[PDB]
Amino acid sequence: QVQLVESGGGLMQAGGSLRLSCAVSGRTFSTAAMGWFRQAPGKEREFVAAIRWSGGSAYYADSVKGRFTISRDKAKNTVYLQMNSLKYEDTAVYYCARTENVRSLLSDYATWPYDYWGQGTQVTVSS
Amino acid sequence: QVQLVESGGGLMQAGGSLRLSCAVSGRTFSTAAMGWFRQAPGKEREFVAAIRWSGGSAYYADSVKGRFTISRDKAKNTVYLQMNSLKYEDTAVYYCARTENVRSLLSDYATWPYDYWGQGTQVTVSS
Amino acid sequence: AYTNSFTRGVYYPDKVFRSSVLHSTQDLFLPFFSNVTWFHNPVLPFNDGVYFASTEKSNIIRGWIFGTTLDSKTQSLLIVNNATNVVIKVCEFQFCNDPFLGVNCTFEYVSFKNLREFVFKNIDGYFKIYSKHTPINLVRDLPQGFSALEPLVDLPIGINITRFQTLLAYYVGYLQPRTFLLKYNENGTITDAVDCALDPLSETKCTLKSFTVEKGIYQTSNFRVQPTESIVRFPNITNLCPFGEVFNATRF
Amino acid sequence: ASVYAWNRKRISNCVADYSVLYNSASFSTFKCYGVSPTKLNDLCFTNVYADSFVIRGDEVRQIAPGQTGKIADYNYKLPDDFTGCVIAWNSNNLDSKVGGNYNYLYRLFRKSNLKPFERDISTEIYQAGSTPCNGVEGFNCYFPLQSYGFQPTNGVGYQPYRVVVLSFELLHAPATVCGPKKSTNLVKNKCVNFNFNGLTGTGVLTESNKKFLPFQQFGRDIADTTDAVRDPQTLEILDITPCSFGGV
Amino acid sequence: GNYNYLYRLFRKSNLKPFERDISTEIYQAGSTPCNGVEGFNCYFPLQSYG
Ligand SMILES: *[C@@H]1O[C@H](CO)[C@@H](O[C@@H]2O[C@H](CO)[C@@H](O)[C@H](O)[C@H]2NC(C)=O)[C@H](O)[C@H]1NC(C)=O
Ligand SMILES: *[C@@H]1O[C@H](CO)[C@@H](O[C@@H]2O[C@H](CO)[C@@H](O)[C@H](O)[C@H]2NC(C)=O)[C@H](O)[C@H]1NC(C)=O
Ligand SMILES: *[C@@H]1O[C@H](CO)[C@@H](O[C@@H]2O[C@H](CO)[C@@H](O)[C@H](O)[C@H]2NC(C)=O)[C@H](O)[C@H]1NC(C)=O
Ligand SMILES: *[C@@H]1O[C@H](CO)[C@@H](O)[C@H](O)[C@H]1NC(C)=O
Ligand SMILES: *[C@@H]1O[C@H](CO)[C@@H](O)[C@H](O)[C@H]1NC(C)=O
Ligand SMILES: *[C@@H]1O[C@H](CO)[C@@H](O)[C@H](O)[C@H]1NC(C)=O
Ligand SMILES: *[C@@H]1O[C@H](CO)[C@@H](O)[C@H](O)[C@H]1NC(C)=O
């Protein structure tokens, strides 16, 4: 079975940076793209970023452009989200999702569904 | 600017009937529904009636069912409230409000907000 | 009233330049010396093409209508020159019973002493309008002579037409798919023409492709008797074939 | 126009310039199916219908073949073999205001799904039950239309978006919607492969002395051979001499 | 949905007979070089079958 495991979440002061990691085990060749989403209590899950597994092209949500960066290590089958300039609005559970549907248009990954999801990791920005 | 002007209020003896008129000037096509509310001194404004501008379907409060009737003339862009069997409890300032939010469910107009309100007209039922 | 189409109704069938040469071409032309109806706003057919002619000293005629019903039921062509401006519309217009002039649109364009000849035809959805203006000294009928009509308008309407009418004397003829020989001078203009089916001499001219043939005998055509009746002979039987037993069979 | 009453502009008898569109950077979605926007300049069509309407962001995906939903079924539907284009861009600056713009409506109820390019603008009271409504709203009797909550602070999915669907048609009629097909410069006195308005060939173009008529375009020889032409842009007549050749 | 099978959606030219193109180069649909970066007029050439 394809297993996604998030890690790196924790308490941070506003203005800092934190690198969340998401490891994928099981199927590797079929990975088409890896996405990061976040959800705050009482709020709907929202798209944060996406990256095509091959090539590494990235697509970012406007709310995190210039602060968050999504990358991936194919050898380790891992996807990393470097969140810089942490804000109190960033406090949420961050999940990573995997999709095997290859789409020519990168922006499609900002709205198309993902078939695999991890358990998520909590991130809290106090001050 | 959208302007709502009420008229027809005055002194009446209990058991009579009175037709309050409310003329609307300015925007006409955007009118979704027209509502009549009333407020007595020291009491909260209360919903009296509502009518969808298109079709003319009406929704009445239980306190006035069988006594008050709401209608509208689209050509004159006016809304009329015929209050029959006037009671001393009907003494209040009657306001007319306009909404451009089209709602499939008519009853929604009994609680949803109105963006335009007139100056109101006083109605007094002595006996 | 009928009059003689002496040698008129000839139009440049294409936008090609040919100099000092005789060209044979089969197309919709006005047969020479044919009968043309004479009018002094009735509805007329549009069988395969129309040659319209008008003689004017006060600009009485103004435009034309074309279509099938011309009663605001389908698309129809309205062409109107009003006093300074030409106008062309293809709207499904509702017309009067007797339209005249006093003193769903898919296209819209805006722009006796005298003789104005026009040729209107409709092929492959294209409406071809050729015309020619000239001065004249004549009041009874058409002047005898020869003049060609250059094209003026090519409209991609894709609209059916079988009837038309005029909006205000004039003359009307109907084109036919005939073969013509046309003499282009050194400047590309048509100076003379021959109807290859009028009389045998014209058949000979077209066969030789020359306007002046030398004496002799020339084999031109082939005479064939045409059938007068159609005969259908079948054995006199009356029994419907039982195809139902096969197609309406319950089990296959 | 509203999605339930999407407008339909008809384009015919004109030069369709598609370069201004697919190269513009003001469009978020410019999808096309079975047709390339660049190849359209090389093609002609009888009619071109631009269907225009506003929908919220998350409903923009329903405008496509094989899609389902409120918009796809009750307001606007596309065929499974659609071969046009769908363009869409955000209109939050235009279709939203402080307080909520409710001028854009959408059909919420209908007795059946719509057909390809079918427009239903009826306001009949929807009979959800077995009791006829008879033009009266109430229990199981609702109004089929409902407004959109377009506000400046709304989410991108809920913010307004203007959408234009370009459908092409080929009837038994002339194609009056063609591309521009920009020309090139002209070279004289050389063997060249020339392509004029409707014709092509290989030859040498030389300043001529012929006199074409105003409506005459390409000249002909005795043996139905093209000897001269008129340049469509400049009204100059050019003689065509075959490129020099001969036995060796 | 099985998305392991793909097809190429863009290419600057048609394939010659029995030609095989396995490249994943970013397709430059416009005049701006992509430099291996996807975006406006820069599309990934392949796409999965549903
Ligand atoms: C003949 O009729 C046409 C219309 O049928 C007139 O053209 C209009 O002229 C006005 C003024 O220039 C324009 O604003 C309109 O757009 C024109 N119509 C169309 C359809 O374009 C024309 O003026 C009339 N002729 C005369 C002499 O008045
Ligand atoms: C073609 O038209 C030209 C121009 O009208 C004619 O050339 C003129 O001919 C007259 C008569 O000899 C001369 O006086 C002029 O000087 C010529 N002008 C030019 C510009 O050539 C020519 O004769 C016409 N040819 C035909 C066959 O009609
Ligand atoms: C087609 O477009 C060209 C380019 O604008 C026109 O060219 C002009 O032609 C006139 C007359 O010869 C010259 O005096 C100008 O200098 C030309 N301009 C340029 C920029 O070269 C040409 O006339 C147009 N032709 C038609 C029929 O519209
Ligand atoms: C042609 O017109 C003349 C003159 O009116 C007439 O005598 C003749 O009969 C017409 N042609 C035919 C075939 O009737
Ligand atoms: C209006 O024109 C369109 C052109 O496509 C045609 O389909 C339609 O039938 C026309 N309407 C009427 C009433 O003829
Ligand atoms: C045009 O005319 C032909 C012949 O009369 C007819 O068969 C055809 O149906 C017509 N076209 C239309 C669109 O009705
Ligand atoms: C078969 O039966 C149907 C009705 O049952 C009839 O309409 C049809 O004509 C029959 N087949 C033939 C060949 O007539």
Q: So where are chain A's domains?
A: 1-127
DSSP C64-103: EEEESS-SSSS--EEEEEETTEEEEE---PPPPSS-----
Q: From ligand 6's centre to the CA of C64, what distance in Å?
A: 21
For ligand 5, is residue C92 a contact (CB within 6 Å)? yes
Q: Do residues B85 and B17 lie in contact, with contact meaning Cβ atoms separated by under 8 Å?
A: yes
Ligand 7 centroid – CA C237 distance (Å)? 22
Please choose, from the candidates D67, D43, D37, the residue with its C-alpha nearest in 3D space to the C-alpha of residue D55: D67
At residue D74, what are phi and psi to the nearest 5 degrees? -105, -15
Run of H or E residues at B48:
strand B46-52
CATH code of the domain in which C86 resides: 2.60.120.960
Tokens read off for B107 = 């009853």
Report the C-alpha gap between C194 and C190 in whole angstroms: 11
Q: A59 near A110, Cβ under 8 Å?
A: yes
Please state the length of chain D. Answer: 248
**Which neighbouring-strand residues pair with D161?**
D55, D90
Burial class (CB in 10 A: 0-12, 13-18, 19+), A72: buried
Residue C48 is given by DSSP the state S
Judge if the beta carbon of residue C241 lies within 6 A of ligand 7: no
d(CA D199, CA E32): 34
Q: Which residue has the tokens 């008898």?
A: D13
Instruction: At B24, give phi and psi (nearest 5°).
Output: -120, 130
CA distance B104 to chain D (A): 4
Tell me which residue of A49, A39, A45, A44 sits closest to A123, measured CA to CA: A39
Its sign, for the CA torsion D109, D113, D117, D119, is: negative
Of D76, D163, D79, D78, the residue nearest D120 (C-alpha): D76
Decide if A8 contacts A94 (C-beta within 8 A): no
The Cα A98–Cα C249 span in angstroms is 58
Q: Which atom of ligand 3 is nearest to the CA of D232?
A: 27
Q: Is C35 in the pocket of ligand 4 (CB under 6 A)?
A: yes
- Residue C78 pairs in a beta bridge with C65, C89
* D19's tokens: 């370069």
Task: Name the amino acid, one letter, at A4.
Answer: L
CB hemisphere CA count around B69 (13 angstroms): 9
Residue with tokens 């409504």: D133
D108 and chain B in contact, CB less than 8 A: yes
List chains touching A (3+ CB pairs under 8 A).
D, E
SS3 state at A42: coil
Nearest to B88 by CA among B118, B126, B60: B126
Residue B6 in tokens: 């009420």
Q: After which residues does chain C show a gap where C to N exceeds 2.5 Å? A: 40, 103, 111, 168
Interchain CB contact of D219 with C (< 8 Å): yes
Question: How far apart are alpha carbons C180 and C187 in whole angstroms?
Answer: 20
Q: How many residues does chain B have?
A: 127
Proximal ligand: closest to the CA of C186: 2
Q: For ligand 4, atom 11, which residue shows the shortest CA distance? A: C35
Enumerate the β-bridge partners of residue B100: none
C6: three-class secondary structure by DSSP: coil
CB D50 within 8 A of CB D214: no
Cβ pair B8, B78 in contact under 8 A: no
What angle is formed at CA D74 by the lines to CA D70 and CA D76, rounded to 5 degrees? Answer: 95
**Nearest in space to D140 (alpha carbons), one of D131, D130, D132, D128:** D128
Is residue B111 within a helix (H) or strand (E), and if so which, with residue range? none
- Label residue C208 exposed, middle or buried (CB < 10 Å: 0-12, 13-18, 19+): middle
The CB of C104 under 6 Å from ligand 5? The reply is yes
User: Which residues in chain D are contacts of A40 at CB distance < 8 A?
Assistant: none
CB of residue C84 inside a 6 A radius of ligand 1: yes
Confirm if C158 and D171 have CB atoms less than 8 A apart: yes
- Cα–Cα distance for residue pair C64/C119, rounded to 1 Å: 12
Alpha-carbon distance of B42 to C24, in angstroms, equals 103
Beta bridge partners, C67, equal C163
Which chain D residues have a beta carbon less than 8 Å from that of C12?
215
Distance, CA of C144 to CA of C152 (rounded, Å): 24
Distance of alpha carbon D49 from alpha carbon D29, whole angstroms = 18
Q: Strand locations in chain C, DSSP E?
A: 2-5, 10-11, 16-17, 21-29, 34-39, 44-45, 50-56, 63-67, 77-82, 85-89, 108-110, 114-123, 126-135, 148-156, 163-167, 170-174, 176-184, 190-195
| CA diameter of chain C | 86
Among residues D155, D202, D180, which one has the least CA distance to residue D40?
Answer: D180
Give the Cα separation of D88 and D96 in Å (integer): 16
CB contact under 8 A, B57 and D137: yes
Question: SS3 string of A86-108?
Answer: CCHHHCEEEEEEEECCCCCCHHH
Q: How many CB atoms are closer than 10 A to CB D129?
A: 9
Q: CA quadruple B105, B110, B112, B117: dihedral positive or negative?
A: positive
Residue A20's Cα: distance from chain center in Å?
8
Whether B106 contacts B54, CB under 8 Å: no
Q: Whose CA is nearest to atom 13 of ligand 4?
A: C35
Q: H/E element holding C147? A: none
Q: How far apart are CA C185 and CA C66, in angstroms?
A: 35
Cα(B23)–Cα(B31) distance, integer angstroms? 12
- CA dist A41 and C245 (Å) reads 74
CB-CB under 8 Å, D138 with B106: yes
Record the resolution, in angstroms.
Answer: 3.3
Q: In the structure, do chain B and chain E come into contact, i.e. share 3 or more CB pairs under 8 Å? A: no
Q: Cβ(A18)–Cβ(A79) under 8 Å?
A: no
Indicate yes or no: CB of B104 within 8 angstroms of CB of D109: yes
Tokens encoding E14: 């048609």
- Contacts for E19-25 with beta carbons within 8 Å, 24 or more apart? E24/A54, E24/A55
**E-interface mutation test, from A54, A101, A114, most E Cβ less than 10 A away:** A101
Q: How many Å apart are CA E30 and CA D30, to the nearest integer?
A: 13
Give phi and psi for D243, each to the nearest 5.
-60, 135
State how beta strands A11-12 and A121-125 pair: parallel
Strand order in the sheet with D177-178: D14-15, D177-178, D44-45
Would the CB of C24 count as within 6 Å of ligand 1? no
Breaks (C-N over 2.5 A) in chain A follow: none
Total domains, chain C:
1
Ligand nearest to the Cα of C1, by number = 4
Residue C184 sits in which domain range? Answer: 2-224
DSSP helix/strand/coil, C207: helix
Unique residue bearing structure tokens 């004289």: D188
Distance CA B70, CA B83 (A): 9
What does each C-alpha distance from D92 to C156, D34, D50, D104 come to in angstroms?
A: 41, 31, 21, 13
Distance from CA of A48 to the nearest CA of D (A): 14
Strands C176-184, C21-29: pairing is antiparallel
D9 burial (CB, 10 Å; 0-12 / 13-18 / 19+) is exposed
Q: Which residue of A has its CA nearest to D156?
A: A62
Identify the helix (H) or strand (E) that includes residue C208: helix C200-208
Give CA–CA dist C178/D64, Å, rounded.
Answer: 53
Q: Which two tokens stand for residue D27?
A: 């469009």
One DSSP character per residue, D120-170 reads: ----PPEE-SSS--TT--BTTEE-SEEE--B-TTS-TTTSEEEEEEEEEE-
Closest ligand 4 atom to Cα of C35: 1
**Atom 12 in ligand 5: which residue has the minimum CA distance?**
C74
| Residue labelled with tokens 């097909």 | D181
For D220, the token pair is 């002909």
Of D174, D218, D220, the CB nearest to C126: D174
Residue to substitute from A108, A109, A111, interface D, most D β-carbons within 10 A: A111
How many whole angstroms separate alpha carbon A12 and alpha carbon A123? Answer: 8
Cβ partners under 8 Å of residue D109, min gap 6: B104, D74, D126, D128, D142, D144
Q: Which residues of D touch A111 (CB under 8 A)?
A: 58, 61
Residue C89 near residue C107 (C-beta atoms within 8 A): yes
Does a structural domain hold residue C66? yes
Q: Is C174 exposed, middle or buried (0-12, 13-18, 19+ CB in 10 A)?
A: buried
Ligand 3 neighbour D185 (Cβ under 6 A): no
Kindly provide the b/e burial profile for residues D219-229, where b requires at least 16 CB atoms within 10 angstroms of the residue's own CB: bbeeeeeebbb
Instruction: Name the experimental technique.
Output: cryo-EM
Q: How far is B106 from D133, CA to CA, in rounded Å?
A: 13
Tell whether D136 is within 8 A of chain C (Cβ).
Answer: no
CB neighbourhood size of C217 (10 A): 6
Q: Which amino acid is at A6?
A: E
Q: Considering the domain boundaries, does residue C231 fall inside one?
A: no
Beta strand A116-117 pairing with E46-48? unpaired
Chain C touching partners, 3 or more CB pairs below 8 A: D
By Cβ distance, the residue of A30, A32, A55 closest to E24 is: A55
Beta-carbon contacts of C247 under 8 Å, excluding residues fewer than 6 positions away, are none
The rounded Å distance from CA C247 to ligand 7 centre is 8
* CA proximity to C72, closest of C99, C93, C53, C91: C93
Whether C30 is in a domain gets the answer yes
Vertex E42 angle, CA E38 and E48, to 5°: 75
Element (H, E) at A31: none
| Secondary element (H or E) of residue A28 | none
**Burial classification of residue D24, based on how many CB atoms lie within 10 Å of its CB (0-12 exposed, 13-18 middle, 19 or more buried):** exposed
E36 touches chain A (CB under 8 A): yes
Q: What Å distances lie between residue C42 and A40, C100, D244, CA to CA? A: 81, 11, 62
Please state the atom number of ligand 2 nearest to the C-alpha of residue C186: 27
Which B positions 89-108 lie with beta carbon below 8 A of chain D?
100-106
The closest CB to that of A104, out of E3, E46, E50, belongs to: E46
**Backbone breaks in chain B after residues (C–N over 2.5 Å):** none
Q: What is the 8-class DSSP label of residue C153?
A: E
Spell out where A26-106 has E strands: 33-39, 46-52, 58-60, 68-73, 78-83, 92-99
Q: C217 in ligand 1 pocket by Cβ < 6 Å?
A: no
What's the rounded Cα separation, in Å, for the pair A98 and A47? 13
In a domain, residue C71? The reply is yes
Q: How far apart are CA C164 and CA C158, in angstroms?
A: 16
Decide if D12 and C106 are in contact by the 8 Å CB cutoff: yes
Q: How far is the CA of A22 from the centre of ligand 4 (A)?
A: 99
Q: What is the DSSP letter of B109?
A: G
What stretch of H or E contains C204? helix C200-208
Answer positive or negative: Cα dihedral of A47, A53, A54, A55: positive
Helix (H) or strand (E) holding E47: strand E46-48
Per-residue tokens: D158: 């809920």
Give residue B83's identity as a one-letter amino acid code. M
**Does residue C242 line the site of ligand 7, with CB under 6 A?**
no
Contact D102 B101 (CB under 8 A): yes
What is the DSSP secondary-structure string of chain D?
A: --STT-EEEEE-SEE---HHHHT-SS-SEEEESSS-HHHHTT-EESEEEEEEEEEEGGGGGGSSTT--SHIIIII----TT--SEEEEEE-TTTS--TT-B---EEE---SSPPPTT------PPEE-SSS--TT--BTTEE-SEEE--B-TTS-TTTSEEEEEEEEEE--SS---EE----------SSEEEEEETTEEEEEEEEE------TT--EE--TTS---EEE-SSS--EEEEEPPP----
Torsion of CA D114, D120, D126, D132, to 10 degrees: -100
Cross-chain residue pair D215–C12, CB shorter than 8 Å: yes
Separation CA C132–CA C114 (nearest Å): 11
Span from the CA of D17 to the centroid of ligand 3 (angstroms): 21
Domain assignment present for C93: yes
**Pairwise CA distance, residues C3 & C140, whole Å:** 10
Q: Which of residues 79-108 of C touch D (CB under 8 A)?
A: 106-107
C227: tokens are: 């059938």
If you compute the radius of gyration of chain D from its CA atoms, what whole number of angstroms results? 27
Q: Which atom of ligand 2 is nearest to the CA of C189?
A: 28
CA A22 to chain centre: 8
Round to whole Å and give the CA distance between D35 and A98: 31
> Beta partners for C117?
C53, C132
- For C37, what's the count of Cα atoms within 13 Å in the CB-facing half-sphere? 12
